Design a protein around this ligand. Structure first.
Ligand SMILES: *[C@@H]1O[C@H](CO)[C@@H](O[C@@H]2O[C@H](CO)[C@@H](O)[C@H](O)[C@H]2NC(C)=O)[C@H](O)[C@H]1NC(C)=O
Ligand SMILES: *[C@@H]1O[C@H](CO)[C@@H](O[C@@H]2O[C@H](CO)[C@@H](O)[C@H](O)[C@H]2NC(C)=O)[C@H](O)[C@H]1NC(C)=O
Ligand SMILES: *[C@@H]1O[C@H](CO)[C@@H](O[C@@H]2O[C@H](CO)[C@@H](O)[C@H](O)[C@H]2NC(C)=O)[C@H](O)[C@H]1NC(C)=O
Ligand SMILES: *[C@@H]1O[C@H](CO)[C@@H](O[C@@H]2O[C@H](CO)[C@@H](O)[C@H](O)[C@H]2NC(C)=O)[C@H](O)[C@H]1NC(C)=O
Ligand SMILES: *[C@@H]1O[C@H](CO)[C@@H](O[C@@H]2O[C@H](CO)[C@@H](O)[C@H](O)[C@H]2NC(C)=O)[C@H](O)[C@H]1NC(C)=O
Ligand SMILES: *[C@@H]1O[C@H](CO)[C@@H](O[C@@H]2O[C@H](CO)[C@@H](O)[C@H](O)[C@H]2NC(C)=O)[C@H](O)[C@H]1NC(C)=O
Ligand SMILES: *[C@@H]1O[C@H](CO)[C@@H](O[C@@H]2O[C@H](CO)[C@@H](O)[C@H](O)[C@H]2NC(C)=O)[C@H](O)[C@H]1NC(C)=O
Ligand SMILES: *[C@@H]1O[C@H](CO)[C@@H](O)[C@H](O)[C@H]1NC(C)=O
Ligand SMILES: *[C@@H]1O[C@H](CO)[C@@H](O)[C@H](O)[C@H]1NC(C)=O
Ligand SMILES: *[C@@H]1O[C@H](CO)[C@@H](O)[C@H](O)[C@H]1NC(C)=O
Ligand SMILES: *[C@@H]1O[C@H](CO)[C@@H](O)[C@H](O)[C@H]1NC(C)=O
Ligand SMILES: *[C@@H]1O[C@H](CO)[C@@H](O)[C@H](O)[C@H]1NC(C)=O
Ligand SMILES: *[C@@H]1O[C@H](CO)[C@@H](O)[C@H](O)[C@H]1NC(C)=O
Ligand SMILES: *[C@@H]1O[C@H](CO)[C@@H](O)[C@H](O)[C@H]1NC(C)=O
Ligand SMILES: *[C@@H]1O[C@H](CO)[C@@H](O)[C@H](O)[C@H]1NC(C)=O
Ligand SMILES: *[C@@H]1O[C@H](CO)[C@@H](O)[C@H](O)[C@H]1NC(C)=O
Ligand SMILES: *[C@@H]1O[C@H](CO)[C@@H](O)[C@H](O)[C@H]1NC(C)=O
Lengths: 107, 174, 99, 421, 198
């Protein structure tokens, strides 16, 4: 499934304050009105390409989505960034983690 | 980051990660004080053009100073007293303000002109546009000249300019 | 006006000759209120370094360093900087640092 | 699509048919001319080397490059006030219309300054001012010598002179004349006998008032009215905005910010990078000044045209075709506008025509009779002589025609009789 | 100062040349403004660089001079075209264009040469003295409205006369001064008088 990204995906290109100005800058942005793949978590957690950068979006009411894994093989053979947000603690690690065939966290 | 300017208070709500602001010209607009987390605007040390209104040195060495597009507030020798005249062109110091209008002599701007008059000094005034002369208009009255004058006027127009020629090779690499 | 027109005689009229700018009275020097030292001692004079393929990265934070005793040191066979002069270094309060 | 070049309209030409208008319309058109442009001034030293002693010392190696650009911009600013003076300050006095505005039925309340309002400005001028729309960075704007109020006073004096004295106030002293008689002269000046004005004085006055009302409506509704002055303002704003933006360019330097170079590079390299920025910014200033000089020459030419129209259109009556609007020029009225002038041209335009049979001359006793003024027309039974620009048939008499030559010479001469009073 | 319009032009050209000459003293980043002092001191690998800087600066100065001269020449060309128009329609003819050939009603013009320019002596007719006369757009005789062929009707308080617009010269109102058009019930402000029939 795909949907329309419309005008989402705009971020501050740097940490310089600007006001009342139209500034033209070239960077890695999400193209306007592009197609974004819609994934479901009901009743499906595949591995997606990262390419040159990924735009991510989520809608929450009970904090179902709790982390991200980035890498190439995700099998302890290379370094893979692991980000987990558990209640109030954001944890970032770059260890050579040995991941399960289908990584998940239980309640 | 170095520079010269007046540091003033601001109402610009900088984000926690933003440290410097910039203007249209990409110059620094404001900074966050590294010791106290407040945002201070940087306004270049107030400035403006300085023009000298003077009669020729064959007449007098007294001058008036026009500070362009400034208030008579922020303003070695020339002080900020005596005759200070605020105009829409700026703050004029050294010229005496005269209520009487005259024909413009040394133009200042925004309707204000200056001249050297009376013991003599530089005066500033609102320039006259001409004498006021109403027309005795009515629906049954016409004025017809009974006499005339033949006048000769002089109109001078440039036709040519000096036919210069530049040896570019000898000039650059003589 | 005389200097602007490069003449000791000024004709009657109005000339734009200069620009009024208030001059500074004192300098204002602002840096983060931190009085700590850098771990450069244990980074340069470390007992053992890492292999080039496993190059080690050491972030630094909240410290002050004097690269003049390093530039003046014959121990360092190579000291070359890009985008910033190695001499003028104790002026610009550095931002990010990764050794 | 392929653009049309206008409607196709054949002319019913023949060797013995003339179309003479039987009715006319008084039209008012709006011609907008730039007179002046923003009196910009550039502090070349602060622009290139703002608050930098080292940069200024390096700039000193370029000699007079700075002061000659200040000189060029000063010359431009001065000639802008010369342009304003040439366009508006053409009257030696400052006349003022009397309270009685009974100008033969012509309503001028929408062009003469409203007494109630503080500044002497007409309703139309108020409409015009509402249509035309770096601070700490060297670039400054000088005020004009003549304020908008003073320009309004000059236009009021010129309008009052034109209304109360016709063209006499321009040549010499203002000689009062009833406005209807002024219009009688204006009609005689275009080949329309003055009796047409007096017979149609109420109709002409109503047509003029309606034309003024339409001008007010057009200027109060259409937003693309002052497209010639707004374009000039936009060009000057764009030039200044481009000049300001040019400060952000590197021109080959590591950074456009002079302070960031000074705090990072040793003199042997900082001087080179600053030399690159100075060269780039000086080239930018020279480009700006050259563009301003060319635009100023265009503005001066436009101002000279505006002054020519003021003198030969408002102060007099123009015989130059389409110089003062389409049609036969009667009069013009000046109005001020931001950095420009608006002329309201009142012209005579033929409205309705009939096909009449004509002849170059009429034979009576063998002599060839030619009209002193007008042409011969026939409605099919009788020949008449009438003025060229308005159908008004008159009996052919010895006071309308003159004799020259004989009937055997003129090609197309017709036989008729000439009445002898 | 009467000839300032031409003297300023001369001064501008002299000033431009003086500025160009002064431009030879600028370094433009070179070690010296004197080309011979660079040539006698530096080897080609550095002398060529210093000379390149001086050439760039002097060529930019020449281009600035030439551009200013082209703009000034265009202004002079427009002025010359105006002068030729004045010669043709002012000296060679008689101008009906208001204030084109001086203030007043143009009669004639006389050319005079001047250094790098032309001076026109414009001889014009200017009304000098005026009187307040009562006027009327038309005169009734037998119910017809009589209008002047040229000039206007005036009254000195007792008699109506017709006179040329630009000079008071009252004449008896006759059928050779007026013409008949329409009737008395149309013209607003028409007055009663008599028209003499020779
Ligand atoms: C018309 O004006 C001219 C001059 O503008 C008058 O000529 C002068 O008249 C006065 C007395 O009337 C003499 O004293 C002068 O010597 C005359 N000057 C010249 C050059 O002749 C002329 O008199 C005026 N005519 C009328 C009828 O007013
Ligand atoms: C001349 O025109 C003006 C405006 O077109 C007239 O002023 C208007 O008069 C009417 C009543 O006659 C008022 O209802 C309007 O409000 C007036 N306009 C304004 C802007 O106040 C004026 O009366 C006309 N004069 C003559 C003699 O016709
Ligand atoms: C000439 O044209 C004018 C208008 O261009 C005519 O005036 C109009 O006449 C109609 C009917 O007579 C009126 O309803 C309008 O109000 C008039 N207009 C104005 C502005 O008053 C005029 O009648 C025409 N005359 C001839 C002989 O054709
Ligand atoms: C051409 O014009 C003449 C002049 O008006 C017309 O002649 C008059 O026409 C009217 C029409 O009602 C008569 O009442 C007059 O008695 C006529 N007078 C004379 C002296 O003929 C003539 O009719 C017009 N012809 C056309 C075809 O329009
Ligand atoms: C205009 O009138 C004249 C004379 O009234 C005409 O001239 C006549 O032409 C015929 C034709 O050859 C001759 O037989 C007559 O002898 C001529 N008359 C005279 C007095 O010489 C002339 O032809 C007429 N033209 C038109 C166009 O009607
Ligand atoms: C208006 O002008 C007429 C024409 O000259 C004057 O009439 C003459 O006035 C003179 C005055 O000396 C008498 O001698 C003549 O006899 C008058 N002639 C006629 C035919 O009346 C008339 O006096 C002038 N009016 C005024 C008020 O000066
Ligand atoms: C000009 O003269 C005519 C007649 O000579 C005047 O017309 C008279 O006007 C009165 C007033 O309405 C009528 O009672 C008469 O019957 C009219 N006369 C005729 C012959 O019809 C006219 O009023 C005069 N105008 C002026 C300004 O004096
Ligand atoms: C998104 O996908 C649909 C069909 O899969 C396609 O028609 C549409 O053009 C795509 N959007 C864009 C921006 O290409
Ligand atoms: C989140 O996980 C980290 C890693 O062990 C742990 O230290 C922290 O207490 C956890 N927080 C919560 C709220 O579970
Ligand atoms: C001053 O002006 C007078 C005339 O106005 C002149 O004669 C004199 O030579 C001038 N002197 C100088 C030094 O300009
Ligand atoms: C100058 O400042 C005073 C108050 O500080 C203010 O009342 C006045 O209007 C100002 N004038 C101008 C020209 O800014
Ligand atoms: C000018 O006139 C005003 C009155 O509007 C008065 O207050 C002021 O003091 C006068 N100034 C001089 C110098 O006469
Ligand atoms: C390393 O040790 C030497 C002396 O053995 C000393 O001179 C040098 O400054 C030290 N380096 C650092 C970074 O402290
Ligand atoms: C004159 O006749 C032609 C014949 O077709 C006609 O087209 C034209 O409209 C007529 N002129 C007028 C003013 O109607
Ligand atoms: C005018 O044209 C018609 C066309 O048939 C012709 O018969 C007639 O002779 C012409 N008249 C003149 C004077 O050319
Ligand atoms: C005409 O009358 C007016 C009325 O005030 C007067 O001012 C004017 O001077 C008079 N003209 C002449 C020439 O006397
Ligand atoms: C001229 O104006 C006067 C002013 O009172 C008036 O009485 C008279 O009727 C007017 N006449 C005309 C023809 O307008």
């Amino acid at each position: 499934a795909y949907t329309n990204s419309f005008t989402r995906g705009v971020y501050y290109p740097d940490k310089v304050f600007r006001s009342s100005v139209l500034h033209s800058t070239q960077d890695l942005f999400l193209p306007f009105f592009s197609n974004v793949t819609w994934f479901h978590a009901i009743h499906d957690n595949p591995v997606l390409p990262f390419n040159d950068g990924v735009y991510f979006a989520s809608t929450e009411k009970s904090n179902i989505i709790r982390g991200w894994i980035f890498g190439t093989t995700l099998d302890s053979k290379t370094q893979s960034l692991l980000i987990v947000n558990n209640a109030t603690n954001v944890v970032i690690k770059v260890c050579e983690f040995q991941f399960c065939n289908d990584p998940f966290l239980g309640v | 980051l170095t520079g010269t300017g007046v540091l003033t208070e601001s109402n610009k709500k900088f984000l926690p990660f933003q440290q410097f602001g910039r203007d249209i010209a990409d110059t620094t607009d404001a900074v966050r004080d590294p010791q106290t987390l407040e945002i201070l605007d940087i306004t270049p040390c107030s400035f403006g053009g300085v023009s000298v209104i003077t009669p020729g040195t064959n007449t007098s060495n007294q001058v008036a100073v026009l500070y362009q597009d400034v208030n008579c507030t922020e303003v070695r020798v020339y002080s900020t007293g005596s005759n200070v005249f605020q105009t829409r062109a700026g703050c004029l110091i050294g010229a005496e303000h005269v209520n009487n209008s005259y024909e413009c002599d040394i133009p200042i701007g925004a309707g204000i002109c200056a001249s050297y008059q009376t013991s003599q000094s530089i005066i500033a005034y609102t320039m006259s546009l001409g004498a006021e002369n109403s027309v005795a208009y009515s629906n049954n009255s016409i004025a017809i000249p009974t006499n005339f004058t033949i006048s000769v006027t002089t109109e001078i127009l440039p036709v040519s300019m000096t036919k210069t020629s530049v040896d570019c090779t000898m000039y650059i690499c003589g | 006006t005389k200097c602007t027109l490069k003449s000791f005689t000024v004709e009657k009229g109005i000339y734009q000759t200069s620009n009024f700018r208030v001059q500074p009275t004192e300098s204002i020097v602002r840096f983060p209120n931190i009085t700590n030292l850098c771990p450069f001692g244990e980074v340069f004079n470390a007992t053992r370094f890492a292999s080039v393929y496993a190059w080690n990265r050491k972030r630094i934070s909240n410290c002050v360093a004097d690269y003049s005793v390093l530039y003046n040191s014959a121990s360092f066979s190579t000291f070359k900087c890009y985008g910033v002069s190695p001499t003028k270094l104790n002026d610009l309060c550095f931002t990010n640092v990764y050794a | 699509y392929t653009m049309s070049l206008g409607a196709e309209n054949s002319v019913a030409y023949s060797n013995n048919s003339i179309a003479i208008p039987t009715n006319f319309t008084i039209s008012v058109t709006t011609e907008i001319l730039p007179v002046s442009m923003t009196k910009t001034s550039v502090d070349c030293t602060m622009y290139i080397c703002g608050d930098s002693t080292e940069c200024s010392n390096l700039l000193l190696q370029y000699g007079s490059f700075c002061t000659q650009l200040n000189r060029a911009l000063t010359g431009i600013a001065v000639e802008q006030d010369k342009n304003t003076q040439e366009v508006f300050a053409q009257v030696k006095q400052i006349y003022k219309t009397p309270p009685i505005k009974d100008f033969g039925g012509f309503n001028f309340s929408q062009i003469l300054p409203d007494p109630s309002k503080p500044s002497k400005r007409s309703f139309i001028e108020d409409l015009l001012f509402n249509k035309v729309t770096q601070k700490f960075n060297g670039l400054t704007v000088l005020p004009p010598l003549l304020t908008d109020e003073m320009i309004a006073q000059y236009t009021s004096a010129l309008l009052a002179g034109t209304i109360t004295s016709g063209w006499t106030f321009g040549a010499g002293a203002a000689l009062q004349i009833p406005f209807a008689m002024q219009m009688a002269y204006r009609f005689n000046g275009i080949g329309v006998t003055q009796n047409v004005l007096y017979e149609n004085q109420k109709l002409i006055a109503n047509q003029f008032n309606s034309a003024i009302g339409k001008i007010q409506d057009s200027l109060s509704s259409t937003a693309s009215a002052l497209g010639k002055l707004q374009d000039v303002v936009n060009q000057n704003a764009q030039a200044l905005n481009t000049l300001v933006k040019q400060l952000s360019s590197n021109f080959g330097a590591i950074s456009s910010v002079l302070n960031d170079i000074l705090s990072r590079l040793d003199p042997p390299e900082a001087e080179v990078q600053i030399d690159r920025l100075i060269t780039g910014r000086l080239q930018s200033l020279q480009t700006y000044v050259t563009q301003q000089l060319i635009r100023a020459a265009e503005i001066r030419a436009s101002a000279n045209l505006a002054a020519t129209k003021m003198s030969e259109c408002v102060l007099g009556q123009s015989k130059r075709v389409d110089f003062c609007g389409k049609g036969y020029h009667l009069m013009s009225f000046p109005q001020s506008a931001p950095h420009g002038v608006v002329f309201l041209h009142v012209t005579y335009v033929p409205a309705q025509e009939k096909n009449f049979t004509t002849a170059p001359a009429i034979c009576h006793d063998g002599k060839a009779h030619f009209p002193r003024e007008g042409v011969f027309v026939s409605n099919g039974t009788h020949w008449f002589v009438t003025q060229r620009n308005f159908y008004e048939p008159q009996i052919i008499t010895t006071d309308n025609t003159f004799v020259s030559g004989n009937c055997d010479v003129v090609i197309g001469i017709v036989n008729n009789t000439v009445y002898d009073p």
